[PDB]
């Protein structure tokens, strides 16, 4: 109910909400191009299959977690150390596994993988990668918020919160990658031994 | 003759860091960080964004005279607004 004795700017139209799903407001000076995406940041669209990205903190879509990092790489393989065993380095010839045997004999030599050992280690490594990446939980979220100029205390609280969680997750992501790469390489050296 | 136990070696140049060692070459690694974007603003899930361009949210909803192209209100996948819009 509207009532006025003056100074009223009345609506002519109202806006019915017809669809209420999640979206968000993105701040950018670019324009729409004739392309498609499942995840969009202010700097451009991303086509991803990995758990983390370093493009921008804000995004609209089903996206990887943002970290403040240039590099997160998980070793899955062996230290690539280029007639001699693990002491010297890797026999170049083997492509059928990770760990294996030379088998020299009088019928003829030839390298072959140890399938039992490689397969157990292989599943160990794939389970490890999955434990590392499946623990990241993201969701569609309109992350950005706007505050007025009289809400500096709240804006700063919000920013601190977001920066705080970014530091925690960047730390956890980098630390986990480094701790796991150390163990991955020890794991592989242990398995050859 | 002898049987040797060894491991794979490759021509991979991919390197990783560990807590106590840095710049270590490995035969395989999984890069788990996405470092690229295409630089374009696209249609999210096949549905275009609302393109306000020069218009602000208040401009759009109130009907700024210069935002007369937004009166058609199509379905949005996201709202695209310039930082510090004019209209």
């Amino acid at each position: 109910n509207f009532e006025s004795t003056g100074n009223l700017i009345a609506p002519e139209y109202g806006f019915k909400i017809s669809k209420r799903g999640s979206s968000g407001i993105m701040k950018t000076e670019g324009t729409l191009e004739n392309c498609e995406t499942k995840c969009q940041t202010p700097l451009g669209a991303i086509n991803t299959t990995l758990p983390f990205h370093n493009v921008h903190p804000l995004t609209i879509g089903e996206c990887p977690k943002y970290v403040k990092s240039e590099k997160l790489v998980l070793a899955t393989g062996l230290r690539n150390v280029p007639i001699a065993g693990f002491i010297e380095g890797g026999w170049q010839g083997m492509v059928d596994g990770w760990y294996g045997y030379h088998h020299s004999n009088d019928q003829g030599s030839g390298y072959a993988a140890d399938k039992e050992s490689t397969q157990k280690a292989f599943d160990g490594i794939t389970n490890k990668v999955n434990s590392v990446i499946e623990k990241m939980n993201t969701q569609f979220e309109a992350v950005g918020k706007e505050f007025s100029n009289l809400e500096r205390r709240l804006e700063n609280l919000n920013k601190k919160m977001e920066d705080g969680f970014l530091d925690v997750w960047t730390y956890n992501a980098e630390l986990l990658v480094l701790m796991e790469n150390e163990r991955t390489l020890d794991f592989h050296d242990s398995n050859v031994k | 003759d002898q049987i040797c136990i060894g491991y794979h070696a490759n021509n991979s140049t991919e390197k990783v860091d560990t807590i106590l060692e840095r710049n270590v070459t490995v035969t395989h690694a999984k890069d788990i960080l996405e470092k690229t974007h295409n630089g374009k603003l696209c249609k999210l899930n096949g549905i275009p964004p609302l393109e306000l361009g020069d218009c602000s949210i208040a401009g759009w909803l109130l009907g700024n005279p210069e935002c007369d192209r937004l009166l058609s209100v199509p379905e949005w996948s996201y709202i695209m607004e310039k930082e510090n819009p004019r209209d």
Partner: antibody
Amino acid sequence: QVQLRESGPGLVKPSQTLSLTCTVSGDSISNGGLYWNWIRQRPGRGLEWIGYIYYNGVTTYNPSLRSRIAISLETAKNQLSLRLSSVSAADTAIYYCAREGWVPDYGGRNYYLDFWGQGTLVTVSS
Amino acid sequence: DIQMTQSPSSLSASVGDRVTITCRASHNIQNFLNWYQQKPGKAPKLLIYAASTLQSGVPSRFSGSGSRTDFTLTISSLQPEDFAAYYCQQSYGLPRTFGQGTRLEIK
């Protein structure tokens, strides 16, 4: 390692088209995922940003040149080029190409220009 | 778009003196300010990026800091070699802009 080198006609007459080419060396133009920029200095005046191109064809420009400017790249030769139509005395400047790198940050990638070329002077006269 | 105001327009200082140059943005540029040093005859060199980080190879006498809308370049222990115009660059938006350039003379 990364160097940028530039060349062009030197002299452009009024109302002609100015065309400059930057050759990127030691940095694959199509693989870095970096933005390539054009910047210029008119006599007396300070640095003015012209525009940039992504490793792909997405291109942005300084709005003051929107009626006159085009930027493009040829991946095959690691080259960038700048084209300005309706060139006049105001366009006399030292032109420079530069590479845009970044720092991941709390607000998103924080961009800066590390590698610059030597630049070249274009004179506009009759 | 976002304009940059740089001040002083010029400085004069002796060898061993410390000076400051500042940047003021018309809008919030959130730690996206870069500083450049331009010696005559050369393309500008990056000194400071992301408000306070020095570029590799930049002498330790250079430093700076700042926050939304206000940043400072500090040059301590000025040497005869630190003769240059210094520029403010705002990387926050797409239509990237620069300040006017501060001309610092060394005695």
